[PDB]
Amino acid sequence: MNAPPAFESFLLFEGEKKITINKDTKVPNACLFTINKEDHTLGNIIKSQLLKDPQVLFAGYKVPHPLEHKIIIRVQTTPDYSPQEAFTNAITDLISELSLLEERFRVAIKDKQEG
Amino acid sequence: NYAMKKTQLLKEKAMAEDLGDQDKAKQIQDQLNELEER
Amino acid sequence: GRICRPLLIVEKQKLLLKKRHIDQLKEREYNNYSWQDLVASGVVEYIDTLEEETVMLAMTPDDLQEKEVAYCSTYTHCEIHPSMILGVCASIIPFPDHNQSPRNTYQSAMGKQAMGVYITNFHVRMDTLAHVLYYPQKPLVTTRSMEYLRFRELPAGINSIVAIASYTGYNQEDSVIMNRSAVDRGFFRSVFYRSYKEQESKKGFDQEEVFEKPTRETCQGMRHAIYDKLDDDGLIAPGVRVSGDDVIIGKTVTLTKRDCSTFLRTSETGIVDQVMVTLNQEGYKFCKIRVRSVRIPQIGDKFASRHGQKGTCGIQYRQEDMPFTCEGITPDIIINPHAIPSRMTIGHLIECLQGKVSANKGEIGDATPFNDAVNVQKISNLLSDYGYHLRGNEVLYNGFTGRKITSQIFIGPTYYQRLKHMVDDKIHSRARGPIQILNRQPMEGRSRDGGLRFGEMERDCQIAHGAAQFLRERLFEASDP
Amino acid sequence: NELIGQTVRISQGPYKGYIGVVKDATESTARVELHSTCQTISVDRQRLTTVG
Amino acid sequence: QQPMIYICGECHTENEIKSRDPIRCRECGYRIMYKKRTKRLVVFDAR
Amino acid sequence: PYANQPTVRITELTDENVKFIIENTDLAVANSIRRVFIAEVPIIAIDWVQIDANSSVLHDEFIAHRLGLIPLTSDDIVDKLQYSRDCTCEEFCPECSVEFTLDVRCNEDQTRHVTSRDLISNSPRVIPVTSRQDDILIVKLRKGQELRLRAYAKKGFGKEHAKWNPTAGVAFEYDPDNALRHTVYPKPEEWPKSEYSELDEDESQAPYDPNGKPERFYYNVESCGSLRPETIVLSALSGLKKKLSDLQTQLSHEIQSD
Amino acid sequence: MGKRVDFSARTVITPDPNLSIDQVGVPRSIAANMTFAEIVTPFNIDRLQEL
Amino acid sequence: RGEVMNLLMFLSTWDGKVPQPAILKPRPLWTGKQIFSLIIPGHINCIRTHS
Amino acid sequence: VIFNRQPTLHKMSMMGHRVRILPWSTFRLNLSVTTPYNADFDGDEMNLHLP
Amino acid sequence: MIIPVRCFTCGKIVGNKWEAYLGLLQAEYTEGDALDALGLKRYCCRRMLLAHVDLIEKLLNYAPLE
Amino acid sequence: RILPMAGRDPECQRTEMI
RNA sequence: UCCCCUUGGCGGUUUUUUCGA
Ligand SMILES: [Mg+2]
Ligand SMILES: [Zn+2]
Ligand SMILES: [Zn+2]
Ligand SMILES: [Zn+2]
């Protein structure tokens, strides 16, 4: 009776932003990004990508509550580079990795199949 | 169709309830056909 | 009324039961050699508890006929098989001698609450409160004695990949994480049927009860309900979706006419499966209506294992989130390790391993208690043959990160049961429901839409709190002003 | 009122192609009990279509 | 627009039992009858 | 700072499973791809069943559910069909769903096997995996029993319901020999060697590797037959790429609103 | 000394470490039945009127 | 840091400042007790005996 | 809300808590709060009273 | 009751093999050999057929609804 | 002894009680 | 320079058995 329909785990309602930017009060150059309708699948990859940024002082993420289809990513960067632009870059390059991998798996298969 | 029980019950009842042995045999002939009939 | 049991007769330190009997009996499928011949021949005897005090009883002839230093030398009987001391619910338990007996008692009790196919004509019956599992299974680890319960043919449970790990903290204090994706696949899914009996009748000379689609222009007592759902007969049609307080049978009693109809019970939300109409003993129209309900196992539903591990579905995680082994094997259920050391249900561990061996071996394992020919070392030997850790632990990779979890998790097929205690049958909330007409206090019980009793021990707790305004509010302003 | 007890198909939103009987109806939303699932969702009447 | 067709038990045959008509199959006269499936729409998600 | 350079190596390729190794990528990326194969890979599955007539003992939801679990030949179909909730036309049409018909009745005395061959489809491209080997046992019918129903298969993904999971079993592994000691064996002599262990049998586990990241992600993606196993991988990379592209889009909205 | 009370609920409990020690994670249906009498006031009239 | 920054995501009262690692070379490593010191609030002073 | 478990032995058997709405039909409670109420999750039920 | 369509744990279709398995079961094959012939090696898949009970055969004994 | 389930017994009751 | 809509919260109860924490 109280099962939320499974689509509520990923479908955004009217007005819900897929991502929400919030400033951190405890430290400078730090934000908490709240992704709605998401889980660990998208969060850990972004976290790991942020760990590659030399201008990221702190980066990690949580799903405030597993029964809540919402996650909280915290980013903290150097004074010359905001956590927001860090997030921008951490999206910009993670997509790049997956796109290049798509091309390499596609060619490795076409070379494997009838070749 | 589900009356196999009805025919079986009718044949079974007649054999003890009827003093003639012929009725049980006549029902037995129907009973053998009943395996396919149901 | 004398309770007795059959026992092997022992005249010398040698059996009365020789190979000729056994040779005849292995062929019992063709020839009917049986107990009658065995007792008539004077090989077996029925000892009663009162008679069991003057008999000297061996446990097995294959060992109690040899000697090192004579212990008895005067046996009179020998146990046929000691595992036969267990009962019906107690005989499904694998490795019961490897569990702390109170846990066994709890499983024995829990074997009575496990959902399953209770009878082959369950689809014919218009009986009240029926539950049948979608896919109950023959246990992978069986006692050779559960074949006689015909549990192989009438199982109540599923061989499930149980992971004994406190995972993500929700698999905690008897609660257990469940595999959401498996549930999608119908894992432990069951259907629940409720049956409604209804008969029209002669209320009296002025009034007589009759099934009819009531209409406002003539029927009194009508409510906001959808009578449109009953067909002109005045009865709901099979295959029509119903919900709490929906009208099921348009019974009407003439005055203009009073609506005495039957509506679906409080909080039910079911679908009419089939509608049977007939005449009762008295020849009045009488009908039984059966409403089916598919019960997807959700969070809070109570599960038990064959070892006394009562536990609620703590949370459900998708297969992507469940931990996985070196291969794509995720546990179906994650149980808390702290539930084991305290309960010492080693039979559970041995079951989870023999089920593992049974699924790898591809044969139904034997978990008869006093086996003596199947022990953990032998089982480990069997498992060690399949390229698996001989003790069953595995390197689980975190479902969230994929990182191996530093501890290799004990994981394997274990026969779990789904108990009837689904949470939706218990969840209850109130705000001005009916009142008992005598003491004008909220009614009692969830069917009557009652209110929770704020007992004396709860009051006393408030007394100790000194929250006198709350105590007064609960006992007056929020109860019966 | 009018569409209580009618069979409506949800023609839009996440519940597109869902069948349910209506238990309430306002100018904007109606409470639809799903014929299939054991839940009763409130949905906009312009998103609803009647099969009857 | 029903004459109120019911399905027998042991006969499995549609029998017309109009209102206030005794529920008995036309054949075998068995007193058990079941209502025919509703003609109302029935759809499931298969989930 | 920038993106690592992933590589791929197909070790085994069948029409049922693919065993391949992905390198020079993060452990998180490799596990995310693992998760995506299971949950975030779209496929077509029966998710709508109108049972016109059923006289079997099995319930309409039971019947529907079993049908829902049937793998459908969807390799090009999922790439062209619209998500069921998303179609702009009213109700359903071939553009957003696949209509099915199953009108079957047992008239012969012997029991009728309601196989997947009995699943009539409005399209020849979408059928249960019965091309070429036994059929999915749906129901067994006695003489005179029938089952007549209309059905639609929807485009969905495994996160919503397992029916949309294209995989049979994914054997994902990294650091086959325990060089990073991410797991520490209490007794290494009790442990079987990995299926991809490229190391001799003398030692139980590889010596500890301190400065070395996880690479050589070994896969065995076995399909349930619905989707070709290599397209599953392409679909997981495209689907994860989609989630990140969608997130970038929503983020652009969240940032440009300055 | 013991009565039945309105605005009281009962449910099966499950563990939940993400909830604070002073918090209760209640189901939506219970809240959908239980109500709390909140007095209207100029400070909250807009809220309660639209509510 | 890749692990620590994941653990600190679950502290409510953490001020957002990473403590100096207990082991700095050859590469920064934090002790569990070091991370645990961030969990302890204010200035607590206690001594107990482990089991 | 004031939360209680039926074998109400002491004052800490009725602590007051803040409500958090969640799906799935159950009264979720914090792990440390399990001990005061002595409330295992094997099928226990707890009463929530709303003032 | 009737063969599950998919393996509960992994998702492999197991509904299209029960008749094949029964054919194999007519012979003296041990329950493990049939799975070996059908190629089901992970124990997650093997548990599906090993533990299945085909009760639908009993369900067919009931009089039919012409 | 077992009678052959024969007779209208309800009628037998009703009629003899007159 | 013929009318016409007018429907809004109904209720068993005792006793015994079984079952949950
Ligand atoms: Mg408990
Ligand atoms: Zn008839
Ligand atoms: Zn369309
Ligand atoms: Zn499997």
UniProtKB/TrEMBL annotation, chain C:
One of its GO terms (molecular function) is hydrolase activity. GO terms for biological process: transcription by RNA polymerase II. It is found in: Nucleus. Residues 35-82 form the RNA polymerase Rpb2 domain. The keyword Iron-sulfur does not apply. Keywords: DNA-directed RNA polymerase, Hydrolase, Magnesium, Metal-binding, Methylation, Nucleotidyltransferase, Nucleus, Phosphoprotein, Transcription, Transferase, Zinc, Zinc-finger. One of its GO terms (cellular component) is RNA polymerase II, core complex. Belongs to the RNA polymerase beta chain family. This is DNA-directed RNA polymerase subunit beta.
UniProtKB/TrEMBL annotation, chain E:
It comes from the Eukaryota. Coiled coil: none annotated. Zn(2+) 2 binds at residues 8, 28. It is found in: Nucleus, Nucleolus. One of its GO terms (biological process) is transcription by RNA polymerase II. GO terms for cellular component: RNA polymerase I complex; RNA polymerase II, core complex; RNA polymerase III complex. One of its GO terms (molecular function) is DNA-directed RNA polymerase activity. The keyword Cytoplasm does not apply. The keyword Membrane does not apply. Its main location: nucleus. Keywords: DNA-directed RNA polymerase, Metal-binding, Nucleus, Transcription, Zinc, Zinc-finger. Zn(2+) 1 binds at residues 8, 11, 25, 28. Zn(2+) 3 binds at residue 30. DNA-dependent RNA polymerase catalyzes the transcription of DNA into RNA using the four ribonucleoside triphosphates as substrates. Common component of RNA polymerases I, II and III which synthesize ribosomal RNA precursors, mRNA precursors and many functional non-coding RNAs, and a small RNAs, such as 5S rRNA and tRNAs, respectively. Belongs to the archaeal Rpo12/eukaryotic RPC10 RNA polymerase subunit family. This is DNA-directed RNA polymerases I, II, and III subunit RPABC4. It comes from Sus scrofa (Pig).
Automatic annotation (TrEMBL), chain F:
One of its GO terms (molecular function) is DNA binding. Keywords: DNA-directed RNA polymerase, Metal-binding, Nucleus, Phosphoprotein, Transcription, Zinc. Residues 191-214 are annotated as: Disordered. The keyword Metal-binding applies. GO terms for biological process: transcription by RNA polymerase II. Zn(2+) 3 binds at residues 89, 93. It comes from the Eukaryota. Zn(2+) 2 binds at residues 89, 91, 93, 96. It is found in: Nucleus. Zn(2+) 1 binds at residues 87, 89-91, 93-94, 96. Residues 17-250 form the DNA-directed RNA polymerase RpoA/D/Rpb3-type domain. One of its GO terms (cellular component) is RNA polymerase II, core complex. Disulfide bonds join 87-96, 89-93, 89-96, 93-96. SUPFAM superfamilies: Insert subdomain of RNA polymerase alpha subunit (SSF56553), RBP11-like subunits of RNA polymerase (SSF55257). PANTHER family: DNA-DIRECTED RNA POLYMERASE, DNA-DIRECTED RNA POLYMERASE II SUBUNIT RPB3. Core component of RNA polymerase II (Pol II), a DNA-dependent RNA polymerase which synthesizes mRNA precursors and many functional non-coding RNAs using the four ribonucleoside triphosphates as substrates. HAMAP family: RNApol_arch_Rpo3. Belongs to the archaeal Rpo3/eukaryotic RPB3 RNA polymerase subunit family. This is DNA-directed RNA polymerase II subunit RPB3. It comes from Sus scrofa. The gene is POLR2C.
From TrEMBL, chain G:
It is found in: Chromosome; Cytoplasm; Nucleus. It comes from the Eukaryota. Belongs to the RNA polymerase beta' chain family. DNA-dependent RNA polymerase catalyzes the transcription of DNA into RNA using the four ribonucleoside triphosphates as substrates. RNA-dependent RNA polymerase that catalyzes the extension of a non-coding RNA (ncRNA) at the 3'-end using the four ribonucleoside triphosphates as substrates. An internal ncRNA sequence near the 3'-end serves as a template in a single-round Pol II-mediated RNA polymerization reaction. May decrease the stability of ncRNAs that repress Pol II-mediated gene transcription. This is DNA-directed RNA polymerase subunit. It comes from Sus scrofa (Pig). The chain holds residues 355 to 405 of 1970 of the full protein.
